[PDB]
Structure formats: structure tokens, C-alpha cells
């Protein structure tokens, strides 16, 4: 997995790859790893949403990212994640170490591709990133993880949370690994398979 969060001058952007692996086998080539906690709080990793919504209805207030962080860390402590969002107090970018510890960051990376992505972030991150520059930077870090790490691949998902407006989720923002067309069609002629019994099922 490769997940990065990049805080920029008016918000925060998180991105992820879309490959899920069962050991060396790619089970899902288009897994969505960015998850809503609330409309403007999203998380990614390598109950909380429902409770956040219930508390938002109870208090009649927009969820704080700190509330999600607190609840999630307390849940993990009772029994890695990046949680990023915008709330009335600004844009936030937190990481949770699943044993209970949390930290603030201006750019983060998680997963097996964390080092390859962090190399790009360290090389190219700067203060006062614009929205487009931050999207480009997060996409580049995810692509570095994709190309250089075996556990990361397929596409780039991006979620952009800017303070003054609603969050925009960019499913499959980039699709650099589209498969080529096969050399031949492997359509069998009908009747190739030998059948013992045929029956109609009363569904």
C-alpha cells in the first residue's frame, strides 16, 4: 500500500494506490483505500463514521478532525492510519500508529511504499503549496510508490479537502497501468464443455 497526505496552503490532500494483495497475488486491482469518516474527514490505512455522524446530529455541529482522531486512537488503544480533513478550525493531517500513538504532519506517507513516497515528498514538498501543486505532488509520491514498490500498483485515488468548499474525491485520478489488448481471443466454441446434468432452479 502507498498512502500520502500533503497539507497545502488552503487545505489538505490525501492519495492512495488501488492494489490489494493476498501475499504475492493481486486480489483486487482497483481497491478504494480512501474512506469517508464524514463529508470532509477522510482516512486511509495500510463504526467511526457512524458514531461521527451520530455525534454531528446530536451536537448540530460539523465534525472536528480531532474528534475522529481521538475516537479512532481510543478505539485502537482499547482493542497505521492517516486521517485528514477540514473543520471549522482549519485543515488537519494526522497519522495514527495502530498501537495508540499519533502525530501531526505537513506531509505523511504510509504503507510498504511509504519510503519511496516520502523520498518524493522530502524532495519536492514546500511551504505554500497551491491546490494544483499539492495534487501533483501527492500524485507523484503515489506514482513513485507504484513504480518502485511491489505492493503498490494500478491507479491513483486522490481526495482534496479545501477549507472554503466541499471535498472532491477523485476516484482513479491517474490510471497509468491500463492493460494492453490480448494477442488472441480465447472464446471457446459452444459445446466445448462436457455437461452431465442440466436443471432449472426455482429461485
Amino acid at each position: 500500500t502507498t498512502i500520502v497526505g500533503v497539507k497545502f496552503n488552503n487545505g489538505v490532500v490525501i492519495a492512495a494506490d488501488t492494489r490489494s494483495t493476498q501475499g504475492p497475488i493481486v486480489a483486487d486491482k482497483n481497491c478504494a483505500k480512501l474512506h469517508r469518516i464524514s463529508p470532509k474527514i477522510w482516512c486511509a490505512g495500510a463504526l467511526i463514521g457512524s458514531n461521527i455522524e451520530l455525534h454531528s446530529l446530536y451536537t448540530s455541529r460539523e465534525p472536528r478532525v480531532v474528534s475522529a482522531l481521538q475516537m479512532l486512537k481510543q478505539h485502537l488503544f482499547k482493542y497505521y492510519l492517516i486521517v485528514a480533513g477540514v473543520d471549522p478550525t482549519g485543515s488537519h493531517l494526522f497519522s495514527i500508529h495502530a498501537h495508540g500513538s499519533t502525530d501531526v504532519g505537513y506531509y505523511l506517507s504510509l504503507g510498504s511504499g511509504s519510503l519511496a513516497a516520502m523520498a518524493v515528498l522530502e524532495s519536492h514538498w514546500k511551504q505554500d503549496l497551491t491546490k494544483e501543486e499539492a495534487i501533483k505532488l501527492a500524485s507523484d509520491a503515489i506514482q513513485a510508490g507504484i513504480w518502485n514498490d511491489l505492493g503498490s500498483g494500478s491507479n491513483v485515488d486522490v481526495c482534496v479537502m479545501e477549507i472554503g468548499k466541499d471535498a472532491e474525491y477523485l476516484r482513479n485520478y491517474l490510471t497509468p497501468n491500463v492493460r494492453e489488448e490480448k494477442q488472441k481471443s480465447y472464446k471457446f466454441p459452444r459445446g466445448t464443455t462436457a455437461v452431465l446434468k442440466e436443471s432449472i432452479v426455482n429461485i
Binding site: 455525534h55 446530536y58 451536537t59 448540530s60 472536528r64 480531532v66 474528534s67 482522531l69 481521538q70
Partner: peptide, 15 residues
């Protein structure tokens, strides 16, 4: 303040 990470609003306390 412990569960939600910020000071309780006045109206939340009233409710």
C-alpha cells in the same frame, strides 16, 4: 474534552 478532543460547547453541555 476527553472523548472528542476539544472543549465541550456551551449548548452541547446544556443539551
Amino acid at each position: 474534552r476527553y472523548k472528542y478532543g476539544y472543549d465541550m460547547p456551551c449548548d452541547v453541555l446544556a443539551k
